Amino acid sequence: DQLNSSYFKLSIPTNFSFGVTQEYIQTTIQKVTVDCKQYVCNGFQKCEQLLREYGQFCSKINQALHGANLRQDDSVRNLFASVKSSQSSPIIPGFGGDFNLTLLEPVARSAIEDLLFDKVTIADPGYMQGYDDCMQQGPASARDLICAQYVAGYKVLPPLMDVNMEAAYTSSLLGSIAGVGWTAGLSSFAAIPFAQSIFYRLNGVGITQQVLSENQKLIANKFNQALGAMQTGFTTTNEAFQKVQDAVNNNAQALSKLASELSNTFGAISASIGDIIQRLDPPEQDAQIDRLINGRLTTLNAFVAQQLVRSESAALSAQLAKDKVNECVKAQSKRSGFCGQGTHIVSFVVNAPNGLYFMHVGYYPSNHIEVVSAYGLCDAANPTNCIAPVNGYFIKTEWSYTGSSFYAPEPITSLNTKYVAPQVTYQNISTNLPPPLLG
Amino acid sequence: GPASARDLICAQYVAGYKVLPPLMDVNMEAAYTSSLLGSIAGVGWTAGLSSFAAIPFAQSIFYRLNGVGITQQVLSENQKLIANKFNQALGAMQTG
Amino acid sequence: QLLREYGQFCSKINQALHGANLRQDDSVRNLFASVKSSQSSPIIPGFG
Amino acid sequence: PPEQDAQIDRLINGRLTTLNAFVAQQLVRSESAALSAQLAKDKVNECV
Amino acid sequence: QQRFVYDAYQNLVGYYSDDGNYYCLRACVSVPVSVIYDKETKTHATLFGSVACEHIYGPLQTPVGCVLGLVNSSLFVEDCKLPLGQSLCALPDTPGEMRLASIAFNHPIQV
Amino acid sequence: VSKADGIIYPQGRTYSNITITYQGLFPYQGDHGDMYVYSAGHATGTTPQKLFVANYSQDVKQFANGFVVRIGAAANSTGTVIISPSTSATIRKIYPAFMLGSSVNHTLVLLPDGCGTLLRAFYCILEPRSGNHCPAGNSYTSFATYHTPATDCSDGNYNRNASLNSFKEYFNLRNCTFMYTYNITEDEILEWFGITQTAQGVHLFSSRYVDLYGGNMFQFATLPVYDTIKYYSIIPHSIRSIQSDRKAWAAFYVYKLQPLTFLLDFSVDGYIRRAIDCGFNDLSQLHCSYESFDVESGVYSVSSFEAKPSGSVVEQAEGVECDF
């Protein structure tokens, strides 16, 4: 309730909690290249002749697929260059001191990163020898997409950067996180303990230094509890984990559509061109082949358009991921809701199948209480001499200073106050005077 | 019959396509905006969202004008003038 | 019968429309959660 | 009936194409609205 | 009794022989072909995706796939004119055959 | 449909370890169907006398696409004999008899014979007989095929034509186009018989031949009938059991066949353990559209219910009148 007086009511939390906000950003899509001649003609000369009358549609399709792959490679290279830090501290066992970062520390990929990949269901890439493996092993699952790709002739190209290189980029970023937030500018990197950086970040949210020293063990325990919740965070309820699964599903759906369309009749007597040749005389059969060709060509044009739309979305999302890494992972973020919910403290980045996974530690207020407060204090004897609290509120405990994010009354000092011009709202105190006004 | 010539809503029923209702009702949406309006007056007192201060909207506006650079002494002299100019802008918004 | 020869096109259309509508609901919930503020002053007549 | 079925097939193909086009249009509009909703959330925090 | 076995895709994945010995049926599988080309060299390297080199200097097996007539430089390069993806890079010997290389992560200064 | 008993299997191909929607003639989900139960004839002491049966023959139902029959559903369960309320005997599986007529000329008759050892299918013109208790003869309540357990069902001697001879006595057989006999192994296990008419020929399906336990029906016989049959009448069968030997007989349920889209569950064997019928309910339509028996929790739009016209309106203009 607002007060009709110089004094104003303030609601300030007497308790603090740490929570991890999990976000998934899709920086890349699986690069798919389709062999138009095998997909539509199926090695039939009549199909090639009918396609030629329409034009070099199959030749145009191959060029478009190549362009999408190059766009994805350029986007991946730019995103990784942005994440890389010029100076980073080497990762060591027991990194973060009292705060436990063992899950973040690399095992190779970090344990949290591996869990994210293991929980998601991904078909085996088989990049080195998948075509040969599919023939000997058979379909891995009913309607296996990987085996279907080889029969159709379309192939899924491998990612521009290998998993080990991507893990190295995340490991360098984790080392840079501990000392990056010392002062403005990226020119100089200071090697400092992660715990020391967290206390400085908490001072920035306005918690008083004395409280941080008293609760140093408590702050470390609460941060560790939030990270433990993050380890169990991957679940069907979690939106971010579902988004990672959805991105894998979207790539899988595109492959499934190509295989399903071939078995579609498209108004032809038989889905198979060879069956049509046996079933009908050649001029009648050629008309049936044309119906299959038109549907298959339309599907390939739609698939190329779908890949182009997905590639455009991935490139824009990758630029957003780069902004997030600089704004939250490489510095504390003043902006609210851009990174973690509540007041952002620190962020960590692990690789995801189609992008980067962001975990943001946030400060959450609890047990709010209402205390009478004043905008400023002025000496009754001297009207000109006045002070205003910095990242704090003056409260009547006669008067004391409390940190903005955490209620903890402390004696008013020159360090926590700034001299200001006198205002009618400012109270006039003569009985008790803080040191900045005792002049 | 059709509310208007070529009425889309009546056409939807004949075709069989249905327009689904919005996830949140108008009253709940109005409550969200009303809560936001109350927060605006005291949200900008200090860095961080942990503490909310209940202060008059006029006091908050004067602090924001101090941030742009108008001097406190000028703000006190023109407090009535600042209120009148803000009210005129809102009247233009109504006819906006 | 003609639709069946092409495929279950009708079933796919219904599912795709439902998915977009569910996506819109998720977006509305996220936007409103962001606008909501933890602590707010009660609105009164003559506010401001 | 055989000649009529061919006419019906032309109507079915156009109607199925219209439904596919409508689904594609709704998907594009839903994607644009979701991106715009994120911008609205940023505006509320930054200015409001 | 049905003899012809079909999957959900409706492809013929299985056939029962007259002798009664069931044989799985897999449609003949095409071998993927891609071209790695450098305009300045005016020479190209034949790329096979996900294919063992046995079915194909002789061919060089790489994690992306089998590359025909490829020589492995095995020298780390930070920047690649024609990256093969993964940690692989094809760098023309400048015309000499393009050389398989390893993309090199740029290590940050360590404090 | 979820039980999938008596679910038709496509003759063209088999599906293994996959789930798909298949269009075929199928019984409606949750349909009681038409139930016909055979009963022992009236008997005094050890001597069988007047036959006792309901007028199944008088009842006529449209053959349409075809029908599927459930056999020995209540078999192996003790029940009161239909003829005698006081007498209770374990129900014994019995085989149904069907008469199908293009006109009400040649009539397709399927007759169980030799106490179910064999099934006889023939397309033959049927001549009513002037004798008393026969269809042409006056004062006949119904015409029923009959067999005697004491002589016909003896293990020593089994009469292949015993039911056929009784059928000849009720109806003369004239110019029968063909005579086919198929031997069915006697069992008390539940069995399914399905009859369908196709342009190539009428097709007979029996569950016992391929999947007796599963209840799936596989075609075992082909009939060369090129005349469409529009009417089918069940033939009542009366068993001449002695009063002491009277036993309960399993009821047979007839379900009509209509083209339906059925979601089908196939095991490694490929037999249909489970199925879903979209037409019966909106939830079933949702399962068919997704092609999954189990779907994740969500609100999903499904095909809207369509209003069906109950009347036809025709308007035409008539003008001018003749003048006297």
Query: A16 - beta bridge partners?
Result: A365
Q: How far, in Å, CA of F69 to CA of F60, rounded?
A: 16
Whether residue A418 lies within 8 A of chain B, CB to CB, comes out as no
Which of A206, A203, A245, A202 is closest to A223 using CA atoms?
A202
**C6 in A contact zone (CB under 8 Å):** yes
Q: Does D5 touch chain A (CB under 8 A)?
A: no
Question: Which region holds residue A425: left if phi is over 0, alpha if psi is between -120 and 50, else beta?
Answer: alpha
- Chain E and chain D touch, per 3+ beta carbon pairs within 8 A: no
* Residue B67 to chain D, least CA–CA distance (Å): 15
Smallest CA-to-CA distance from A306 within A262, A346, A253, A269 is with A253
Q: F66 with F197: CB under 8 angstroms?
A: yes
- Residues of E in CB contact (< 8 Å) with A are 7-11, 13, 24, 26-27, 29-32, 34, 49-52, 54-55, 61-65, 83, 85-87, 103, 105-111
Q: Distance, in angstroms, between A223 CA and closest chain E CA?
A: 25
Tokens of A400: 């004391």
CA–CA distance, A351 with A117 (Å, rounded to integer): 9
Residues in C closer than 8 angstroms to D18, CB to CB, are none
The resolution, in angstroms to one decimal, equals 2.5
How far is A265 from A226, CA to CA, in rounded Å? 55
Cα–Cα nearest to B47, from A202, A371, A182: A202
Tokens linked to F290: 């997704």
Annotate A310-341 with DSSP letters as a single string.
Answer: HHHHHHHHHHHHHHHIIIIISS---SSSSSSS
Is the Cβ pair C18, F301 closer than 8 Å?
A: yes
Cα–Cα distance between A35 and A304 in angstroms, integer?
12
- Put simply, whether B52 touches C (Cβ < 8 Å) is yes
**Chain F contact partners (≥3 CB pairs within 8 A):** A, B, C, E
**Residue E5 burial (10 A CB sphere; 0-12, 13-18, 19+):** buried
Contact with chain E for residue F210, Cβ under 8 A: yes
Q: Which of A74, A79, A72, A91 minimizes the C-alpha distance to A30?
A: A72
Site of tokens 């400085």: A200
| 8 Å CB contact of E7 and F18 | yes
Say yes or no for a CB contact (<8 Å) between E86 and A127: yes
Cβ F297 vs Cβ F287: under 8 Å: no
Q: Measure the CA–CA gap between F315 and F320, rounded to whole angstroms.
A: 17
Question: Cβ of F103 under 8 Å from any chain C Cβ?
Answer: no
Interface B–F counts its CB contacts (< 8 A) at 5
Between vectors from CA E88 to CA E45 and to CA A168, what angle results, nearest 5°? 165
Residue of E nearest to A161 (CA): E86
Q: Is B9 on the interface with D (CB under 8 A)?
A: no
CA distance F163 to chain B (A): 57
Query: How many CB pairs (< 8 A) connect B and D?
Result: 3
Give the sheet arrangement for strand E88-93, strand by strand: E71-77, E96-103, E88-93, E82-85
Judged by CB atoms closer than 8 Å, whether chains meet at C25 and B29 is answered as: no
In the block, residue with structure tokens 């697929």: A65
Cα dihedral across residues F122, F127, F129, F135: positive or negative: positive
CA geometry: angle F256, F257, F263, nearest 5 deg: 125
* C-alpha A283, offset from chain centre: 57
E strands in chain E: 4-6, 12-16, 22-24, 33-38, 43-49, 60-61, 65-67, 71-77, 82-85, 88-93, 96-103, 109-110
Cβ-based neighbours of A69, under 8 Å, separated by 6 or more: A31, A33, A157
Contact F312/B at CB under 8 A: no
- Please tell me which chains touch C, using 3 or more CB pairs under 8 Å as the contact test: A, B, D, F
Q: What is the per-residue burial (b if ≥16 Cβ within 10 Å, else e) of A74-85?
A: ebbbebbebbbb
- Count CB atoms within 10 A of the CB of residue A184: 7
Q: Which residue has the tokens 């495929």?
A: C7
Q: How far apart are CA A382 and CA F212, in angstroms?
A: 106
Instruction: For residue F108, give the nearest of F237, F253, F238, F228 by alpha carbon.
Output: F228
What is the 8-class DSSP label of residue A26?
Answer: -
- Interface touch A335/D46, C-beta < 8 Å: yes
Are the CB atoms for A149 and A123 separated by under 8 Å? Answer: no
What are the strands of the beta sheet with A427-429, ordered from one edge?
A417-419, A386-389, A377-379, A427-429
> Which residue of chain D comes nearest to B49, CA vs CA?
D45
Where is chain B discontinuous (C–N over 2.5 Å), named by the preceding residue?
A: none
Does F298 contact C at CB distance below 8 Å?
yes
Residue A332: C-alpha distances to residues A97, A99, A271, A344, F180 (Å): 20, 18, 59, 7, 89
Rg (CA), chain A: 31
Element (H, E) at B9: helix B8-15
Nearest CB to D37 within list C16, C20, C27: C27
User: Tokens 């025909």 correspond to what residue?
Assistant: E68
Written as one letter, the residue type at A322 is: K
C vs F, Cβ pairs < 8 A, gives 25
Q: What is the 3-state secondary structure (H, E, C) of A334-386?
A: CCCCCCCCCEEEEEEEEEECCEEEEEEEEEEEEEEEEEEEECCEEECCCCCCE
Task: State the sign of the Cα–Cα–Cα–Cα dihedral F272, F275, F277, F280.
Answer: positive
Residue type, F64: A
Chains contacting A (3 or more CB pairs within 8 Å):
B, C, D, E, F
Distance CA F69, CA F75 (A): 15
Number of continuous H segments (helices) and E segments (strands) in chain F? 3, 22
Q: What is the rounded distance in angstroms from the CA atom of residue A68 to the CA atom of residue A321? A: 20
DSSP H or E segment with residue B43: helix B26-43
The minimum CA-CA distance between F135 and chain B, rounded to whole Å, is 55
Structure tokens at F51: 């036959």
Contacts of B37 (CB under 8 A, 6+ apart): C43, C47
F16: its two tokens: 């293994």
Q: Do B24 and C21 touch (CB under 8 A)?
A: no
CB-count exposure of residue A118 (10 Å: 0-12, 13-18, 19+): exposed
Which of C7, C39, C41 shows the shortest C-beta gap to A2? C41
3-state secondary structure of E100: strand
CA–CA separation, A323 and A25 (whole Å): 11
- The structure tokens 């530690």 sit at A361
The packing angle between helices B26-43 and C9-35, to 10°, is 30
Burial (CB < 10 A; 0-12, 13-18, 19+), residue F252, is buried
* Residues B54, A9: C-beta atoms closer than 8 Å: yes
**Residues A99 and A198 sit within 8 Å (Cβ to Cβ):** yes
Query: Is residue A410 left, alpha or beta, with left meaning phi > 0 and alpha meaning psi from -120 to 50?
Result: beta
Q: How far apart are CA F233 and CA B9, in angstroms?
A: 52
Residues contacting F6, CB < 8 A, separation 6+: F27, F68, F69, F70, F192, F194, F207, F215, F216, F217, F255
Dihedral of the alpha carbons of B71, B74, B79, B82, in degrees to the nearest 10: -80
Question: In sequence order, which ranges of chain F are alpha helices (DSSP H)?
Answer: 162-170, 207-211, 282-290
Residue of chain D with shortest Cα separation from A305: D24
CB-CB neighbours of B6 under 10 Å: 7
The answer to whether residues A329 and A88 touch, using CB atoms and an 8 Å cutoff, is: no
Q: Are E37 and E48 in contact (CB under 8 A)?
A: no
Closest C-alpha among E81, E110, E108, E109 to residue E95: E81
Residue with tokens 């990270």: A227
Residues 232-251 in A contacting C (C-alpha not used; CB under 8 Å): 239
Q: How far is CA F296 from each of CA A304, F286, F293, F299, F304, rounded to the nearest angstrom? A: 31, 11, 10, 10, 21
Q: How far apart are the first and last CA of chain A?
A: 36
* CB-nearest partner of A10 from B49, B53, B73: B53
Tokens of C18: 């439902």
CA angle A238, A243, A248 (to 5 degrees): 130
Quick check: D48 contacting B, CB < 8 Å? yes
- Are the CB atoms for F25 and F9 separated by under 8 Å? no
